[PDB]
Amino acid sequence: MILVFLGPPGAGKGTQAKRLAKEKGFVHISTGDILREAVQKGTPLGKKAKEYMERGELVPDDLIIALIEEVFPKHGNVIFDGFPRTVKQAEALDEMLEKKGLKVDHVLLFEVPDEVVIERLSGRRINPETGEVYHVKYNPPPPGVKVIQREDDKPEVIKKRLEVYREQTAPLIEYYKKKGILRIIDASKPVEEVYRQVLEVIGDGN
Numbered sequence: 279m280i281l282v283f284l285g286p287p288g289a290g291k292g293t294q295a296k297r298l299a300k301e302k303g304f305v306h307i308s309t310g311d312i313l314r315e316a317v318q319k320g321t322p323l324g325k326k327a328k329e330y331m332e333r334g335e336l337v338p339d340d341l342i343i344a345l346i347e348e349v350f351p352k353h354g355n356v357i358f359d360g361f362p363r364t365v366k367q368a369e370a371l372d373e374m375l376e377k378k379g380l381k382v383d384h385v386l387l388f389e390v391p392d393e394v395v396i397e398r399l400s401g402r403r404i405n406p407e408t409g410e411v412y413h414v415k416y417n418p419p420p421p422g423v424k425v426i427q428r429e430d431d432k433p434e435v436i437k438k439r440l441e442v443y444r445e446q447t448a449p450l451i452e453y454y455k456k457k458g459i460l461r462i463i464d465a466s467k468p469v470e471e472v473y474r475q476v477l478e479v480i481g482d483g484n
């Protein structure tokens with residue numbers, strides 16, 4: 279089974295992908311997490327990606343397609359989390375899967391209003407030692423745990439990331455709807471409720 283999580287930044291895609299991977303055995307491919315690590319390590323991908331990320335722009339398609347080709351697992355169920363983000367990426371994914379006799383099975387659109395994702399992003403915190411994601415209101419970090427704020431979670435960069443989503447990524451909704459594999463998730467609900475709907479749409483009995 280191959281899943282794609284699609285939606286605005288702050289919709290809760292990473293949170294749901296991590297839980298599904300932990301509980302249901304999926305391989306979690308987060309282009310965001312992989313890119314952030316590349317930046318921290320200063321790899322050729324990282325050094326090139328850094329400035330796009332910092333501006334809230336998408337990293338160029340060529341770099342991302344190569345990344346996915348390199349890391350796509352030979353076996354296992356997969357959650358693509360924040361990939362594809364453009365039509366060219368989606369076309370490349372389809373071709374990569376075809377060559378392996380596979381296909382995208384479900385695309386989940388995390389539907390949620392702007393004011394919700396803006397509060398979620400503004401309040402997002404990360405434990406730099408474990409990578410664990412918190413929210414100052416909805417899931418506070420434990421006392422005594424040092425956390426950081428992502429630079430791209432600043433108000434002006436958030437604005438850009440949302441603009442980019444609406445311009446470049448939202449066209450994937452129709453792309454996948456035409457394939458008959460798009461299902462809509464109410465991502466505005468609490469974490470547990472969203473997770474139950476995720477399981478429902480992918481045909482899991484929970």
Ligand SMILES: Nc1ncnc2c1ncn2[C@@H]1O[C@H](COP(=O)(O)OP(=O)(O)O)[C@@H](O)[C@H]1O
Pocket residue numbers: 286287288289290291292293294398399401402403411412413416417465466467468469470472
């Ligand atoms: N259903 C939810 N309700 C409230 N807060 C959430 C929910 N899902 C995620 N969060 C919080 O919102 C922020 C964004 O979630 P995240 O999973 O990082 O979203 P994305 O990967 O779509 O950008 C994080 O701080 C996370 O703790």
Ligand SMILES: Nc1ncnc2c1ncn2[C@@H]1O[C@H](COP(=O)(O)O)[C@@H](O)[C@H]1O
Pocket residue numbers: 287309310311313330331332334335336337338342359360361362363364367430439
């Ligand atoms: N599939 C992708 N294509 C291009 N850029 C990406 C992709 N995934 C993540 N990024 C970059 O990484 C940043 C953080 O990703 P995310 O954590 O998914 O919001 C984005 O704002 C982009 O700069």
